[PDB]
Amino acid sequence: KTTLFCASDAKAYEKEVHNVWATHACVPTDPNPQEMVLANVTENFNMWKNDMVEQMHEDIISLWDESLKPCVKLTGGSAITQACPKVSFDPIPLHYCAPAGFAILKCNNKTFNGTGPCRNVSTVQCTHGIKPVVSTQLLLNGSLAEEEIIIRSENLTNNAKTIIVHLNESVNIVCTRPNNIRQAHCNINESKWNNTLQKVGEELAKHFPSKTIKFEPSSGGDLEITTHSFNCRGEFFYCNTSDLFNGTYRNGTYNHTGRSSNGTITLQCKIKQIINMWQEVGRAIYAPPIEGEITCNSNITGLLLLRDDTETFRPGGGDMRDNWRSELYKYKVVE
Ligand SMILES: N=C(N)NC[C@H]1Cc2cc(CN3CC[C@@H](N)C3)ccc2[C@@H]1NC(=O)C(=O)Nc1ccc(Cl)c(F)c1
Ligand SMILES: *[C@@H]1O[C@H](CO)[C@@H](O)[C@H](O)[C@H]1NC(C)=O
Ligand SMILES: *[C@@H]1O[C@H](CO)[C@@H](O)[C@H](O)[C@H]1NC(C)=O
Ligand SMILES: *[C@@H]1O[C@H](CO)[C@@H](O)[C@H](O)[C@H]1NC(C)=O
Ligand SMILES: *[C@@H]1O[C@H](CO)[C@@H](O)[C@H](O)[C@H]1NC(C)=O
Ligand SMILES: *[C@@H]1O[C@H](CO)[C@@H](O)[C@H](O)[C@H]1NC(C)=O
Ligand SMILES: *[C@@H]1O[C@H](CO)[C@@H](O)[C@H](O)[C@H]1NC(C)=O
Ligand SMILES: *[C@@H]1O[C@H](CO)[C@@H](O)[C@H](O)[C@H]1NC(C)=O
Ligand SMILES: *[C@@H]1O[C@H](CO)[C@@H](O)[C@H](O)[C@H]1NC(C)=O
Ligand SMILES: *[C@@H]1O[C@H](CO)[C@@H](O)[C@H](O)[C@H]1NC(C)=O
Numbered sequence: 001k002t003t004l005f006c007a008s009d010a011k012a013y014e015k016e017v018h019n020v021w022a023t024h025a026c027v028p029t030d031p032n033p034q035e036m037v038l039a040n041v042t043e044n045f046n047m048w049k050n051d052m053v054e055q056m057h058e059d060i061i062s063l064w065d066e067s068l069k070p071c072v073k074l075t076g077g078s079a080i081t082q083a084c085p086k087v088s089f090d091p092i093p094l095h096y097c098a099p100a101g102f103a104i105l106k107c108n109n110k111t112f113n114g115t116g117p118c119r120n121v122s123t124v125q126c127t128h129g130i131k132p133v134v135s136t137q138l139l140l141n142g143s144l145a146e147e148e149i150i151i152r153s154e155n156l157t158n159n160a161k162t163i164i165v166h167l168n169e170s171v172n173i174v175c176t177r178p179n180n181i182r183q184a185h186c187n188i189n190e191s192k193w194n195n196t197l198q199k200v201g202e203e204l205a206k207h208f209p210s211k212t213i214k215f216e217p218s219s220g221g222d223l224e225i226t227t228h229s230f231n232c233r234g235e236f237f238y239c240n241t242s243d244l245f246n247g248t249y250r251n252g253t254y255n256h257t258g259r260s261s262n263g264t265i266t267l268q269c270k271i272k273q274i275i276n277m278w279q280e281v282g283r284a285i286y287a288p289p290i291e292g293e294i295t296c297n298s299n300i301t302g303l304l305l306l307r308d309d310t311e312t313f314r315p316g317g318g319d320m321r322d323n324w325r326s327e328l329y330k331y332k333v334v335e
Contacts, residue, residue, distance in 0.1 A: 001051050001102075001333040001334075002098075002099060002102050002333060003055070003099065004052060004055050004096050004097065004098060004099070004333060005026075005027060005096075005097055005099060006022070006025065006026040006027070006059060006094050006095065006096055006097070007026055007027045007028060007029045007030065007094075007095045007097050007126055008022035008023070008026035008027075008028075008029060008092060008093070008094050008095065009028075009029045009092070009093065009129070010022035010023045010026065010092055011023075014088075015087075015088055016087075016088045016089070016090055016092070017063070017066075017067030017068070017087050017088070017089055018063065018067070018089070018090065018091055018092040018132075019092060020067070021062070021063045021066055021067060022092060022094065025059070025062070026094060027097075029095060029126075030125065030126065034124065034125050035106075035122055035123070035124050036122060036123035036124070037120075037122050037123075038120070038121055038122060038123065039120065040119075041121050042117055042118065042119065042121070043105055043107075043117070043118055043121045043332070044116060044117050044118070045105075045107055045112070045114065045115070045116070045117075045118060045329070045330070045331075045332050046114070046115055046116075047114035047115070047152065047325050047328065047329035047330075048114070048115070048154040048325065050325065050328055050329075050331070050332065051333065052096060052127075052324075052328045052331055052332075052333060053321055053324045053325050053328050054321070055096070056094075056096060056130070056132070056324045056328065057320065057321050057324055059094075060132045060134075060320070060324070061279045063132065064134070064279060065279065067087065067089070068087070068089070068231070068234070068286075069082045069083060069084055069085075070082070070084055070275075070284035070285055070286050071084035071285050071286055071287055072284070072285040073277075073282060073283075073284050073285075074282050074283040074284075074285075075280065075281075075282040076282070084286055084287045086234055086287065086290050087234060088233075088234070089231060089232075089233055089234040090233070091131040091132055091133050091141065092131070093129030093130060093131050094129065094130055094131075094132060095126040095127050095128065095129055095130070096126065096127045096130070096328075096331075097125055097126035097127070098124075098125060098126075098333055098334075101335060102333060102334065102335050103123050103124070103125070103333075103334045103335050104123070104124050104125065104126070104127060104331055104332070104333055104334070105121050105122070105123060105124075105331065105332045105333075105334050106121065106122045106123070106124050106127075106330055106331055107120070107121055107330040107331075108120035108121065108122055108330075110145070110146040110147040111147055111148065111150060112150075112329070112330060113150055113151065113152055114150075114152040114164075114325075114329040114330075115152075115154070127328065127331050128143070128327075130324075130327045130328070132323075132324075133230070133323065134230065134231060134278060134320055134323065135228070135229065135230040135317070135323065136224060136225050136227075136228060136229050136230075136304065136315070136316075136317030136318060137218070137225075137227070137228040137229075137241055137245075137303070137304060137315035137316070137317050138173070138228050138241075138300045138302070138303060138304075138315075139164075139300070139301055139302030139303065139304065139323060139326055140173075140230060140298045140299065140300065140301070141298055141299055141301065142299070142301035142302055142326060142327060143301065143327060144166075144167060144168050144169070144170060144301055145166045145167060145168040146168070147168065148168055148203075149165065149166065149167055149168055149199055149200060149203050150165075150166040150203075151163060151164075151165060151166075151203050151204065151207060152164040152165075152166060152325075152326070152329060156207055159306065159307050159308055160306075162304055162305075162306060162316055162317075162319065162322050163303075163304070163305040163306065163307065163313070163316075164302060164303070164304060164322060164325070164326050165200055165203075165302055165303035165304075165305060166301075166302050166326065167196060167200075167300070167301055167302055167303070169192075169195070169196065170299035170300065170301050171188060171189070171192050171193060171196050171299065171300040172188065172189060172192070172297070172298075172299065172300075173186055173187070173188050173297075173298050173299075173300050174186065174187050174188075174295065174296070174297050174298075175232060175237055175239065175267075175269065175295065175296050175298070176293060176294065176295035176296075177235070177269075177271060177289065177293065177294045177295075178293040178295075179291075179292070179293055181271075181288070181289055182270050182271040182272070182289060183268075183269075183270065184237060184239075184269040184270070184271060184294070185266050185267060185268060185269060186228075186239050186266060186267040186269060187264045187265070187266050187267075188244070188264065188265045188267075188300075189263065189264060189265075190256070190260040190263050190264060190265055191263065193244070193256065193265065194254065194256060196300075197215060197247055197249075197254055197256065198249065198253075198254030200303070201213045201215075201247075201249030201254050202249075202252070204249075204311075204313070205249065208311045210309075211309055211310040211311040212248065212249060212250045212310040212311075213248070213249035213310070213311060213312075213313070214247075214248050214249070214310055214311065214312035214313070215245045215246060215247045215248070215249075215312070215313055215314075216245060216246065216312050216313070216314050217241060217242035217244075217245050217246060217314065217315070218241065218242075218245070218314055218315045218316070219314055221318075222276045222318075223238055223272070223276070224238070224275070224276045224278070224318070225316070225317055225318045227239055227240055227241060227269075228240075228241050228244075228267070228315070230296075230298075232294060232295075232296035233294045233295075233296065234290070234294075235271045235289050235290070235294055236271060236272055236273075236275050236286065237269050237270075237271060237296075238269060238270050238271075238272050239267040239268070239269035240267050240268050240269070241267060241315055242258070243258040243259050243260075243265050243266075243267065244258060244265060244267065244315075245313075245314060245315050246258035271289045271294075273285060273286055273287075273288060278318065278320045279320075302326055303315070304316045304317040304322060
């Protein structure tokens with residue numbers, strides 16, 4: 001369509017990499033909110049062909065390649081070495097704004113599944129504040145569904161299409177490596193995981209009716225996708241989810257078949273140094289983990305699943321563009 005720019009709310013004094021990159025490439029955020037409503041102005045969206053997603057993907061790649069410089073980067077035959085200094089790392093919201101002569105349409109149907117027509121469409125200058133959170137399996141620190149859970153997918157009958165489950169009630173996940181230096185663990189509440197997976201199962205049954213829904217651990221692939229992986233305070237966490245995606249949904253009953261304990265599920269995690277880059281096909285070797293207790297307290301605001309007589313779903317991810325899509329679904333650049 002055109003070239004979108006970014007307005008952040010970053011502070012220049014901050015040594016945090018997100019703030020630095022933003023203040024160099026993002027303009028200041030406009031204080032007054034310019035929004036233009038419309039009642040019957042029907043319009044069509046396709047989150048899966050959105051170009052905003054591609055632009056933000058480019059900018060996030062530029063961020064990570066300017067901020068989390070690896071000790072070594074293996075791309076094909078090349079091996080590039082740089083300084084890999086540890087750095088303060090905490091995502092900051094970024095808004096994507098339409099330049100002059102261009103608008104951003106925003107679908108206001110609280111149940112829009114990302115494909116097709118929208119009843120209530122507004123006109124804005126900037127998207128809401130989006131946090132470029134890189135993760136797999138679980139979507140972290142996102143915005144929730146205002147009404148009920150939504151199931152987004154390009155083709156719900158194509159096993160290959162990644163399913164984005166968009167929740168309406170966040171679920172607390174706490175991950176920590178306290179004072180093996182790469183051993184860490186995560187805790188989630190078994191009761192709230194109950195409710196979340198049971199309601200996701202109800203919706204998934206709305207879409208797949210006869211068959212009984214099943215949640216199973218990640219089939220196979222690189223460690224970065226067979227586990228819930230993410231960056232926390234700087235370090236790369238890889239966490240096991242087999243005690244998380246592990247239940248069955250039959251006649252409105254979701255029985256969780258994962259190993260809980262005292263009411264909380266813990267996940268075993270390793271802090272790996274050889275990362276399989278999401279930006280491009282290559283590897284990145286980073287410096288050994290710092291000291292202190294590294295801990296992140298995150299919200300599970302979404303899921304990435306992949307289907308395969310009953311229907312079974314597994315944690316997926318890896319195309320970091322799906323993360324951006326999960327937030328830019330309700331937007332479209334126009335004019
Ligand atoms: N080749 C390489 N080195 N990267 C390719 C990317 C692109 C893609 C695409 C599919 C899609 N699948 C469907 C069809 C299949 N062909 C592939 C799966 C995995 C992947 C890979 N993503 C990752 O590696 C990744 O995200 N790492 C990572 C690192 C740090 C953190 Cl914090 C994190 F959270 C994650
Ligand atoms: C969230 O979605 C579920 C399933 O669609 C629904 O039962 C619930 O009432 C919604 N709102 C919540 C949980 O606040
Ligand atoms: C999304 O909703 C549209 C109608 O708005 C429908 O045509 C399409 O099949 C739906 N897709 C999914 C995966 O729910
Ligand atoms: C999804 O793929 C199936 C075949 O795999 C076929 O119905 C069609 O190509 C797609 N359906 C829709 C509604 O786009
Ligand atoms: C919900 O979580 C509680 C917490 O321990 C557990 O007792 C119960 O079995 C869970 N419910 C289901 C359906 O798994
Ligand atoms: C997760 O844990 C199970 C058993 O605890 C193990 O069989 C599986 O290989 C683990 N997966 C990864 C990626 O470590
Ligand atoms: C579910 O959890 C139990 C206990 O942690 C484990 O033995 C079992 O293999 C898990 N299910 C799957 C399908 O991995
Ligand atoms: C979190 O788990 C504890 C037990 O582990 C439970 O008492 C509490 O009710 C859970 N949180 C919510 C919101 O239910
Ligand atoms: C999510 O936000 C909280 C609050 O800023 C932060 O402590 C946590 O590290 C964030 N999680 C991720 C994965 O960025
Ligand atoms: C989780 O979601 C709540 C919802 O209001 C939000 O206020 C909070 O900042 C989010 N993050 C954490 C770490 O609680």
